[PDB]
Amino acid sequence: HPSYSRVHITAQAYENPSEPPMFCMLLRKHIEGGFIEKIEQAGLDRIMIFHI
RNA sequence: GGUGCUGGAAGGUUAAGAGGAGCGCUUAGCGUAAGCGAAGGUGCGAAUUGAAGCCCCAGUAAACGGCGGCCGUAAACGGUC
């Protein structure tokens, strides 16, 4: 989000699953079915690295 | 992919020619009536064989030939026929 950007494990139900955009479709094409190797930070900056 | 060219019969379509089943027409004669009829002669000839070629399978574009549309996103990428 431009003001509310965050990364956390949510617990509430984010409803209205509308028709997915093309970034979500490419994520389901490329990422789904895989495993997560490690979650590490690029130094001390606000950069999150996900190893899939 | 289609058409040309080259190669390949696994499988169908295959002509003429071989092949002759069988079915008509005549009658020596059996028959009260209408029909049946051997041997010949004379027409129609069904099955079975019978190559190239065609359907088919591959390659070949300095062979013939062709190289598209809609909607987004900033040539390029994404969705669909």
Swiss-Prot record:
Induction: Up-regulated under secretion stress conditions, possibly in a CssR/CssS-dependent manner. Changing residue 45 to Y: No longer binds tRNA(Ala) anticodon (UGC), has minor Ala tailing ability, decreased accumulation of a stalled reporter protein. Disruption phenotype: Not essential in rich media; synthetic growth defects are seen in double rqcH-ssrA mutants, further exacerbated by translational inhibitors spectinomycin and erythromycin or at elevated temperatures. Decreased accumulation of a stalled reporter protein. Double rqcH-rqcP deletion strains grow normally in rich media. Triple rqcH-clpP-ssrA mutants cannot be generated. No change in sensitivity to erythromycin; double mutSB-rqcH and triple mutSB-rqcH-ssrA deletion strains are hypersensitive to erythromycin. Loss of Ala tailing. Associates with isolated or stalled 50S ribosomal subunits. Binds to RqcP. Interacts with ribosomal protein uL11. Displaced from the 50S subunit by thiostrepton. In crystallized 50S subunits RqcH is variously associated with A/P-site tRNA, P-site tRNA and RqcP, an E-site tRNA or A- and P-site tRNAs and RqcP2(YlmH). Has 4 domains; N-terminal NFACT-N, central helix-hairpin-helix (HhH), 2 coiled coil domains with a beta-hairpin in the middle (CC-M), and C-terminal NFACT-R. The NFACT-N domain contacts 23S rRNA, the A/P-site tRNA anticodon and recognizes tRNA(Ala), while the M beta hairpin binds protein uL11 near the base of the bL12 stalk. Belongs to the NEMF family. Activity of this protein is best tested in a clpP or ssrA deletion mutant; ssrA (tmRNA) encodes the SsrA tag added to nascent proteins in stalled ribosomes by trans-translation, which targets the nascent protein for degradation. Key component of the ribosome quality control system (RQC), a ribosome-associated complex that mediates the extraction of incompletely synthesized nascent chains from stalled ribosomes and their subsequent degradation. RqcH recruits Ala-charged tRNA, and with RqcP directs the elongation of stalled nascent chains on 50S ribosomal subunits, leading to non-templated C-terminal alanine extensions (Ala tail). The Ala tail promotes nascent chain degradation. RqcH, RqcP and charged tRNA(Ala) are necessary and sufficient to add an Ala tail to a model stalled nascent peptide; does not add Val. This is Rqc2 homolog RqcH. The lineage of its organism: Bacteria, Bacillati, Bacillota, Bacilli, Bacillales. The chain holds residues 53 to 104 of 570 of the full protein.
